Design a protein around this ligand. Structure first.
Ligand code: NDP
Ligand code: SF4
Ligand code: SF4
Ligand code: SF4
Ligand code: SF4
Ligand code: FES
Lengths: 100, 115, 688, 164, 121, 101
């Protein structure tokens, strides 16, 4: 399952959207439908959901050593933002590893 | 209108009460004032400096002061060999006032009928 | 509507005004600033100054525009000969007994009486009699009272009775011998006691610490924000050169109206003592003056000498968002994940901003007729917020408290003092629930000391249960609110300044680092700062952290720079530099960028706008300065998603919900170094 | 009927500002700053466009946004620069060229005036909207009769009367 | 319920506590807060007069302290600073009731003290 | 001591009104090399002490080279007397000699 894997590929996952934007509807749907389970597996992973008026939908992930990648998800769907999160997880395994 | 000087009261207390009217009125910006309340509760200056190399001797300070504290004394022969000697502080102004008080008071006894 | 906006005429000008407005308010809407002495915006109508007299058609007497209601079809005249005659006579009656104290009065230059006499008065006086001599009064070390200057505008009495709620001042005597003050020798116990001098339109009430220091026109006014708490009051800074002389509040209805805590009023004095101006590195003889190059090299060597898991960063109360994010990027770039906050609860999850903010907002709170307090003391956490709470109380708003019963300057209901009482209230065991369940706009507010509890998840779960049962959060309304007492907490939460799970586990088994860095922190616990460990301190005041430190970088104080600070409601505000840098001090984020370059990993930004843009990329709302977004709400999904944290470390039903703030007058080093707060503490200790 | 401070020279300053041909002049960004002849580094600093808030010391409202159309009330400032003291006297020493030129001279009726001024001069600028004053009063003490209405302690109960 | 707060248990830093500006009797309660400026801190000066006066010369404070209070009939006294009003300070009216030789009223303009044994004492 | 001499008390960009926080006494200041040395030190904002044996006429050119209170003229220097030397360096952490024959 991707949800359980979403604890080692990255150190932080960050989400940007707008409360009232039409293109922000899909990310709103995904967050409402998935935040509980995406946190139940890992009760301490930082998942920063942030919103502001007139902004743009995007998914941004933080990795070790401060490595960070972002993908815009404006105009997509809940399945599509799930897909983008899946590619985000895919790149997370091929990253420098820290903590030790 | 000659050398600026600081006056006291006959008991010995400074006339200046740091109302800063003199600094406010001075178009030469040659007056620097710092003040706070004295240990007895009195409102007295902590820094009273006038730049004679910058003072224009207009006497507007003498016009503005409502307690006759700052006065341009009848001393006019006070040229110095260095410019630093003309950076008048509170202490030198008080010395000048104590020196020239009698003449200034006598002149005020005349000028009071006009001022 | 039945014409809620009625029409009148002022000097033949039609002006549309709301119903119940006064002629004073109408003339204000007409663009005329009528002279006035006793009326105030935030106080009740007194109407004893007689300075608001105007002329109305079909009225033989001048009417009190400060008190006269406006009737439809009314005509108001403000420039007739009788108007000016009355104004001049009133000014003359004001000035006959007033002592000639302008040269020694501190309000000269900002005296409403003086300007109003200049404009609406005459130039000559026909009074040659002996004046009335009034002895001065003692109210404490904060306010200097020159009672002979008093015009008896009664503003002090109304303010003390209404805003402060102490009601300790009154009018003694009668007629000319009418006297103002307290019959007995009393010390003004008001925490917002410094507002009276600003509200005093004359020099009768003057700030004792500010007395005879400097003049109003000698100052440069810089609009700033208050960092002494989490409310962030909008203030103006007045300075003469590089030295701060006084700090005054400024108008912000949505935040603090026209009010300022005396702590935020008198703590500027501390900026003159124990100041760090030069970099210091601990040598064999001890700490000594060294260059920024030397100090930065030593810090880089100390940082690189240790493993990434042996480096801990702690953020103080007064660190700005820029320095916090810069240091977080610095420590993350080197594999370190140990983050701590001096404001506590550094491990609290921060996924939804609404979960740790005031969703009703401060001004939206005034729409609530019922308010619930859960383990908070707004009087000592935010006296301005407490004053706004009292204002809400003044027109029917009922308040409930769950926690320690303390003096809050208004009547209230004490439901309980422990989480068991909260559980009983949520179960239905208390009548307060039904009052909550019947209130149209109920409100619940929780302080930060609750968030400092080890069982904070359980308390939050119980609060959410009560909110759901009482419908506190519903359509078009959100009575759920989270407040704080420190400014830097909100920006750290929003930027994700939180320790990694690996660092949390390392604390759990007791791993102890060797490299410790302080960002202006002086109230750390001993458990996060091991003895014998190298300490790199950045700050602007010599204090406990500085003394134990090994390398010191003289930073910038909030009065010297422009840092970002967001209050607990989530409104972005920024300070402003009023005086230049003290000593060889440098910009905090510039310091951290220099350290990053020296270590071997440069930060990708090289400007203040660049780091602010980095913040915006981290969180979009940072760009919106002096505004606030509406946070999203996710119902009980968040609570059901943090259920495991509730399972571990279960609820403690015995620990009371208290306030961790035990010293109002001293909370940070600047407060700990201020002479005025110490004087107030001694005065409160000399009353016994 | 039109009456907006209609007894002064300000009307003569209202007009001659709307003269045709003279009211259509425009310049590009940084273009006017080229004509200044001042050192080029002047435009590198940041500036604040704002109106100072009303001082808490006084109830005066003339120097506030309330009389906006009456008097130019928008100010442009610069970040303060390094300052120190004279070793011999203690007077404040500084080297800022832009220390006071704004707070003494630069005054503007509207924010857009200062925006155009900065744009044509090339000064990078920040806009800070001043807070609006509230005229509506509170529910308590809303009118003078509220000081003495029944809300203070409720309706008097007629239970202490003789014969109750 | 609503227990009292113990002010004496509050910790006070020693360094800040010992540098609070107190005052002599003068015109105020003894030992009250004294306003101070940042001048003299770099030179470590904690005396008002020491900021500007140098040496052991007689200070103006000592001069005025050598003048005994003045006994005047009535309840209100008028102070000009000189025999002729125009040569001194603006006229000041100072309350004389509740004042004694021990506790007189000091001039805010000139520092001269006055008292009256007319308030039934 | 290492770099605290040039860094601790540096106030200002480095101009005439600036303060380098450096106190020095130069011997042979009115000499050919010492004059330029003093003019170089003071122009950065340093306190300079100039004791001299020759005439004040030959030394007046040095007076302009510093700001108010930063040019110290000590006439009638005796190199055989250590009292004047002790007074010359009583406040200076830097000593520069150019007395040559
Ligand atoms: N190319 C050069 O010029 C070289 C110069 N130097 C050194 O540079 C220094 C100055 O060079 P320069 O300035 O060109 O030579 P100068 O002769 O121009 O400088 C002479 C200075 O020495 C002072 N002096 C000499 N003897 C005494 C004394 N007994 N008591 C007091 N003051 C005395 C003179 O004071 P007064 O004016 O009263 O005589 C004058 O100020 C010298 O020390 C010289 O050794 C080194 C190598 C080469
Ligand atoms: S000299 Fe006179 S005018 Fe100037 S501050 Fe003193 S009392 Fe005021
Ligand atoms: S005489 Fe004129 S220039 Fe001199 S101090 Fe007085 S006001 Fe200033
Ligand atoms: S309150 Fe105003 S009018 Fe009265 S003495 Fe003070 S400055 Fe003068
Ligand atoms: S003391 Fe000040 S606020 Fe109080 S009645 Fe007198 S003038 Fe008004
Ligand atoms: S405001 Fe009208 S009499 Fe006071």
């Amino acid at each position: 399952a991707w949800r359980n894997s979403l604890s080692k590929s990255m150190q932080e996952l960050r989400i940007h959207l707008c409360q009232t934007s039409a293109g922000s509807k899909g990310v709103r749907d995904f967050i409402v439908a998935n935040y509980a389970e995406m946190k139940k597996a890992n009760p301490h992973f930082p998942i920063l959901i942030r919103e502001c008026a007139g902004t743009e939908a995007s998914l941004t992930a933080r990795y070790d050593f401060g490595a960070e990648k972002s993908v815009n998800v404006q105009g997509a769907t809940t399945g599509a933002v799930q897909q983008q999160l899946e590619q985000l997880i895919l790149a997370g395994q091929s990253m420098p590893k820290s903590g030790e | 209108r000659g050398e600026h000087a600081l006056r006291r009261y006959p008991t010995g207390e400074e006339r200046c009460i740091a109302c800063k009217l003199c600094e406010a009125i001075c178009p030469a910006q040659a007056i620097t004032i710092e003040a706070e309340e004295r240990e007895d509760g009195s409102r007295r200056t902590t820094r009273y400096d006038i730049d004679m190399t910058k003072c224009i001797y207009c006497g507007f300070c003498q016009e503005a002061c409502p307690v006759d504290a700052i006065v341009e004394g009848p001393n006019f022969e006070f040229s110095t060999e260095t410019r630093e000697e003309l950076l008048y502080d509170k202490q030198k102004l008080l010395e000048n006032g104590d020196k020239w008080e009698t003449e200034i008071a006598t002149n005020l006894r005349t000028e009071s009928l006009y001022r | 509507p039945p014409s809620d906006h009625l029409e009148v005429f002022v000097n033949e000008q039609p002006v549309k005004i709301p119903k119940g407005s006064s002629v004073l308010q109408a003339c204000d809407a007409a663009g005329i600033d009528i002279p006035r002495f006793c009326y105030h915006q935030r106080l009740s109508i007194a109407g004893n100054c007689r300075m608001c007299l105007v002329e109305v058609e079909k009225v033989p007497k001048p009417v009190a525009s400060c008190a006269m209601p406006a009737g439809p079809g009314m005509k108001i005249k403000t420039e007739t000969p009788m108007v000016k005659k009355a104004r001049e006579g009133v000014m003359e009656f004001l000035l006959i007994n007033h002592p000639l104290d302008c040269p020694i009065c501190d309000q000269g230059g900002e005296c409403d009486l003086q300007d109003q006499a200049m404009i609406f008065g005459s130039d000559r006086s026909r009074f040659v009699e002996a004046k009335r001599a009034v002895e001065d009064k003692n109210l404490g070390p904060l306010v200097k009272t020159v009672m002979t200057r008093c015009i008896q505008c009664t503003r002090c009495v109304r303010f003390a009775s209404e805003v402060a709620g102490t009601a300790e001042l009154g009018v003694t005597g009668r007629g000319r011998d009418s006297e103002i003050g307290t019959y007995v020798e009393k010390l003004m116990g008001s925490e917002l006691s410094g507002n009276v001098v600003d509200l005093c339109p004359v020099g009768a009430l003057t700030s004792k610490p500010y007395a005879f220091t400097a003049r109003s026109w000698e100052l440069k006014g810089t609009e700033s924000i208050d960092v002494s708490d989490g409310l962030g009051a909008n203030i103006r800074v007045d300075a003469r050169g590089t030295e701060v002389m006084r700090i005054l509040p400024r108008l912000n209805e949505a935040v603090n109206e026209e009010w300022l805590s005396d702590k935020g009023r008198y703590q500027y004095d501390g900026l003159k003592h124990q100041r760090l101006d030069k970099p210091m590195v601990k040598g064999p003889k001890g700490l000594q003056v060294a260059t920024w190059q030397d100090a930065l090299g030593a810090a880089a060597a100390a940082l690189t000498s240790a493993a990434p898991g042996e480096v801990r960063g702690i953020a103080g109360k007064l660190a700005d968002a820029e320095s916090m994010v810069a240091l977080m990027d610095l420590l993350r770039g080197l594999g370190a994940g140990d983050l701590a906050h001096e404001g506590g609860f550094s491990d609290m999850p921060a996924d939804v901003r609404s979960t740790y903010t005031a969703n009703t907002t401060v001004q939206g709170l005034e729409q609530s007729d019922l308010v619930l307090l859960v383990g908070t003391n707004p009087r000592w956490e935010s006296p301005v917020f407490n004053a706004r709470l009292r204002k809400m109380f003044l027109d029917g708003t009922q308040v409930g408290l769950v926690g320690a019963p303390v003096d809050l300057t208004y009547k209230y209901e004490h439901v309980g003092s422990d989480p068991a009482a909260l559980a009983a209230l949520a179960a239905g065991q208390h009548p307060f629930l039904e009052r909550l369940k019947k209130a149209a706009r109920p409100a619940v507010v929780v302080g930060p000391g609750v968030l400092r509890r080890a069982d904070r998840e359980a308390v939050m779960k119980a609060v959410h249960e009560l909110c759901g049962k009482a419908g506190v959060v519903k359509e078009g309304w959100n009575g759920f609110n989270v407040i704080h007492d420190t400014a830097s907490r909100v920006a750290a939460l929003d930027m994700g300044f939180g320790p990694s799970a690996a660092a949390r586990a390392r604390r759990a088994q007791g791993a102890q680092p060797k490299v410790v860095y302080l960002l202006g922190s002086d109230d750390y616990s001993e458990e996060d700062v091991p003895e014998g460990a190298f300490v790199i301190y950045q700050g602007h005041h010599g204090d406990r952290g500085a003394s134990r430190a090994n390398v010191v970088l003289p930073g910038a104080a909030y009065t010297e720079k422009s840092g970002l600070y967001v209050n607990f409601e989530g409104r972005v505000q920024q300070t402003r530099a009023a005086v230049p840098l003290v000593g060889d001090a440098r910009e905090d984020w510039a310091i951290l960028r220099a350290l990053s370059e020296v270590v071997g990993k440069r930060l990708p930004y090289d400007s203040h706008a660049a780091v602010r843009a980095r913040l915006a990329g981290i969180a979009p709302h940072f760009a919106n300065i002096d505004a606030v977004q509406t946070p999203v709400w996710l119902n009980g999904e968040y609570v059901k998603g943090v259920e495991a944290l509730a399972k571990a470390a279960p609820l403690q039903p015995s620990a009371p919900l208290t306030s961790t703030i035990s010293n109002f007058y001293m909370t940070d080093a600047i407060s700990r170094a201020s002479r005025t707060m110490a004087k107030c503490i001694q005065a409160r200790q000399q009353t016994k | 009927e039109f009456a907006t401070a209609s007894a002064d020279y300000s009307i003569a300053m209202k007009k001659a500002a709307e003269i045709t041909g003279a009211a259509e002049s425009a310049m590009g960004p940084k273009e006017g700053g080229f004509t200044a002849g001042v050192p080029l580094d002047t435009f590198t600093r940041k500036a604040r466009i704002y109106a100072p808030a009303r001082t808490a010391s006084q109830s005066g409202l003339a120097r506030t946004v309330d009389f906006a159309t009456t008097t130019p009330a928008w100010k442009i400032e610069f970040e303060p620069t390094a300052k120190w003291q004279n070793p011999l006297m203690g007077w404040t020493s500084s080297a800022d060229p832009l220390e006071n030129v704004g707070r003494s001279a630069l005054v503007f009726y509207t924010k857009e005036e200062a925006m155009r001024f900065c744009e044509k001069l090339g000064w990078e600028y920040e806009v800070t909207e001043p807070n609006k004053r509230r005229t509506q009063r509170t529910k308590r003490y809303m009118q003078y009769g509220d000081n003495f209405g029944t809300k203070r302690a409720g309706v008097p109960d007629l239970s202490t009367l003789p014969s109750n | 319920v609503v227990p009292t707060f113990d002010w004496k248990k509050v910790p006070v830093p020693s360094t800040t506590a010992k540098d609070i500006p107190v005052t002599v009797k003068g015109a105020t309660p003894a030992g009250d807060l004294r306003a101070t400026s940042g001048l003299g801190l770099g030179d470590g000066i904690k005396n008002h007069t020491d900021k500007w006066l140098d040496g052991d010369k007689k200070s103006p404070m000592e001069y005025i302290n050598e003048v005994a209070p003045i006994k005047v009939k009535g309840l209100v006294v008028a102070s000009y600073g000189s025999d002729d009003p125009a040569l001194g300070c603006p006229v000041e009216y100072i309350n004389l009731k509740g004042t004694s030789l021990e506790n007189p009223a000091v001039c805010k303009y000139t520092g001269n003290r006055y008292y009256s044994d007319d308030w039934k004492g | 001591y290492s770099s605290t001499l040039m860094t601790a008390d540096k106030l200002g960009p480095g101009g005439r009104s600036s303060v380098s926080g450096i106190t020095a006494t130069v011997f042979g200041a009115n000499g050919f090399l010492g004059s330029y040395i003093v003019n170089e030190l003071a122009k950065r904002g340093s306190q300079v002490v100039c004791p001299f044996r020759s005439t004040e006429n030959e030394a007046m050119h040095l007076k302009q080279m510093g700001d108010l209170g930063q040019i110290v003229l000590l006439p009638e220097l005796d190199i055989r007397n250590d009292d004047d030397i002790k007074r010359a360096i009583s406040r200076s952490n830097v000593i520069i000699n150019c007395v040559g024959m």
